[model samples]
Target: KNIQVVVRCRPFNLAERKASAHSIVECDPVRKEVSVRTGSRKTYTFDMVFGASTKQIDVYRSVVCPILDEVIMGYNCTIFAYGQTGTGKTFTMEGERSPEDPLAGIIPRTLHQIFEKLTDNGTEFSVKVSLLEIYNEELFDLLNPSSDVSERLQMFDDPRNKRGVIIKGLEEITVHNKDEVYQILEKGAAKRTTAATLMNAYSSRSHSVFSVTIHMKETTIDGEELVKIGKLNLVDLAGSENINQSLLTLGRVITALVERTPHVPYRESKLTRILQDSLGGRTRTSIIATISPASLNLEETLSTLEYAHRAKNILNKPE
Candidate 1:
């Protein structure tokens, strides 16, 4: 498949639980549908829908495992968590901070699986990782050791390769094992920007992207050497206003790509510009839209569902 859009309704957090906020959203995983009650009930369908009680492992197995399989077969892939602030986007994507936790989210799980296969199959592969954040339309390298958030990066187009978008002056480190990858992620996360808001304490202030690129060398039956490359991008986006702007712009980009509109405003926002390749270029993409069920968040929750519904319809028709 080209692109799949999924919805995940997060459980009520400590504040909501303490307040005993009533749930307005219900999900039927069997039917792959989610319904929200505002006045009356409105339902939205997707490739898959996850309920509040869905475990991290279940989510990983159902949503991410297939994408990992495709990536190993040399497909570029992207998985992004989208929603309002404090809706468990970060938890769903990165999970608990403790690496040993069984519920360590999609990024760690994918790394573990990849390295396991690498060792088991005795494959010759080289993997590199890069981490960056986009804030207020400025890019910062999270993998960079420097503490200066003021230092910014730029994006450029590579004319030689079709639909090639590259970030200039960003650090990409070679990683061999899963542990190494985890350490790299820890370093990047320490530098990620977060601030307390009405929605969350450690709320993400920008869209942070963790990308892994794999280069595999294999020999054919006739002894011909072939190289296969794959890129996997995991994005945990900002949860506030900029978040809405980025995700909405992403919807616009998807529409342009799917409809073949004359003008695709890929450059309208930095988030869309960075995601140009994953959205409509050559990558298999999945979106996990998180939402709050509390009636207090009624407006944001409905808007999120509508955005996700529109996104589910924007597809890359096979050429």
Candidate 2:
């Protein structure tokens, strides 16, 4: 199966609006095409397209709901938010949680939805949450309730053949209620902020993988005790903060995969090496390409569109 690619255009920010920046991108959801109003007037089609005014709930339902269903059905799923900085990378995945807000974002909404979905199913299940902030090789586990933030993790998989990876020192927190899930996210956020301040490199330049692993207890047990397992990784990727970094390697790997090249370049970077496991095996991935509506950012937006469009061709066999 091919990875699902969805393009969502961000609405003009208040500052951008005051700066006289107007929307250069238009999404015709009926046709699933995104038309850009540059001099070339380019148009790109995707698995799905959402306009600037698309609400958070609309996005969650459109993209995340099906994956959430599959995650409950013992499937490994990963959703990626990739684009330029301030282009809805964080807002798209983890939107506001204020009481005045009319809707919630992907992470919180999915957490509550999972609890509710399983609550009525009459099935025994357990859920755990984890967050990994990977900045080049310096990996930090944000949810590792400790005095310091950087509990640097090591990538442990078969030496050079990095197909799947086991992250050493990564912490997973068992979550129960809706409030518990919210509190865990807030704690991770605090830790992430601390790390950003302590370290020279700020976040948004780092890739954070937030995962929710589900274990369903099998009622029809024979002699051996058993549980069906599934995982959902909400990966928050960085922008073009710099080059020769993990993001560079990610592009190379994506290009390699798209071209059906002999070498996939998985070992070139730790990020790609870790993602190799998720991409090589039975996992369904959905990448949300967030783009700014301002014409000022059209160059980077066009690059993102090209990368995401080609990503639609990379194939995988999900058993």
Candidate 3:
């Protein structure tokens, strides 16, 4: 499947607007396009476009629900949130905490929805989740049970699968029920290398990967038993502070793949190495490129748009 790339323009906050950060982004959802008001104005169309007024639910419904549906059917899927610093990448990926809050972003809603649908089916299934963070090219297990979140982990290429790498010592938690997911998420989130409280360093430099794996067992009418595995990866990439090495490598990999180059450089960075299977391999992937509607972010916004738009050309296959 061709990767679906969408652009979301965030509204100016009270502070930004207070500073007279006039809107520079024009989003026409119906046209599926975004036009920026620069000296040389240009429009770029995407699979979907969310304007400044877009509700979190709209984004979840328009982009995530379909991908989630596919994951339930035993497919491997990935969703990436990318953009310049403070463009609401974290806001879009891990929105509000209040369960009923309409502002809740993709991750919480996805957790709630998965349990609601999965439990209703009464299927024999087990759900597992893991969180891995890559900061300065080192792996940190946010979901680890250890008291220290600073312990670095290692990764090795999978011997059996050329496209897969085993992240050593990464903690994978077995979620007992849907309600427990939020607790798991909160615990891990606080452990991110930078909780920003002097308690945590600044996390904008880290790329985090949150994974949910579902293993469902099916009984054939003839008494045969089979297991179907489904995987979903939610990635919140690092901010575009000079396009860090990981994001740089990610771009190179995307360029190489879309250009159909024989040598895709997945080994150059830990982010790309971990995402090797999803970038141009066997996982269905989508990128939600978040941007600011202010002239201050025009350059970075254009850069992000071009990169995400190019990602649409990379294709994936069934695992």
Candidate 4:
């Protein structure tokens, strides 16, 4: 259960509701099935299926909490929200930004949980965070306001670091508290590119990755001093057109993983290269596939479902 795949059906928003759009996707939480009934009815199964009426907390519990737990045990983990534009992928991953709000999204909730556990166990740990955006195949350091967009950012397998892969020149800030992390989140989000689209008023134009790395000092059961390193990569991928080149290459990578091919195409795209470890290396991964239930989005909905279906079948065994 390393790469747990879950599908979330977002309800029609104010614009769609006003247009009288009807839902064609039926989600069954108990059976973890999502059925599309637009043209030909079909059902797909996943680790979890979240309905339109599902609460954010429930989604976090079923899909994200487990990954969070594994990270505490010194495992690298990644959770990705993938889908079409305005399908609530951003809503699911980023959610409400207000920290005072009880319904804060996965990112804030994850930070809160980390601090809670750190206090509960009274463990001494250090944290480093970095936020970056990938746009039109180029990388931008969102946290570093002065980092020129024209500067070329490179990704390579670093022989010096235990983290395996490195994004050269990317800024990683050391943070001590939740408030500090929240400030960085807000700053990065402000720098993210968004545009008004026919589908959404504020649509994300780039993929945003918020990574948190934790290092802890603990004594092993055998009475030896050990240092544990863990990383949590929360990725909100851009909503590209159906069957885009980048996504197709990602699909190919997944196919290679499932087929046990000798060559995995991690370098095919910037997104895939950054996610190499999470896809086929020593990382626990999960995907939140968001889809619209509107009958108007029939083709896009089907494509998203198909992508998720294929991703769920990938044979990922966390080592």
Best of the two (3, 4) by lDDT: 3
Using alpha carbons, what is the TM-score of model 4?
0.88
Clashes of each: 0, 0, 2, 0
Each candidate's lDDT (Cα)? Answer: 0.77, 0.78, 0.79, 0.76
Best by lDDT: 3
Top candidate on TM-score is 3
Name the candidate, 1 or 4, with the larger lDDT value. 1
User: What's model 2's lDDT at 165?
Assistant: 79
Model 3: worst 10 consecutive residues (lDDT sum) = 310-319
- Model 3 C-alpha lDDT per residue in residues 1-319, reported as the tens digit of each score: 4567789888887777778787888888887888888776677878788998999999999888988887887877888899988888888988866534687788878877877787776668788898887777777788877646456887888999898889887888998865787798788877863444533445787787988888877566767666778788899998875578778688777667656689989899888788777667645577899999987778898898777767654232221
RMSD of 2: 4.5
Backbone clash total for model 1 is 0
Instruction: Write down the RMSD of all candidates, one decimal each.
Output: 4.4, 4.5, 4.4, 4.6
Q: Write the per-residue lDDT of candidate 4 for residues 219-312, one digit (tens) a residue.
A: 6566767678878889888784545466777777765765568988878888877877666664668878899898877788888888887865
Q: Measure candidate 4: CA RMSD.
A: 4.6
What digit string (tens of lDDT, one per residue) describes model 1 on residues 1-319? 5677888888777788788788899888887777788777887788888988888998898888888887888877788898888888888887875534676898888888888887787778988888887766678787888545566787888787645677888899998778787688778766663322321323366788888888987665766676788788898888743544666787887656555678888788888777666566656788898898787787888888887877656332222
Off by over 4 Å in 3: 98-100, 193-201, 220-226, 313-319
Error of 3 at 31 (Å): 1.6
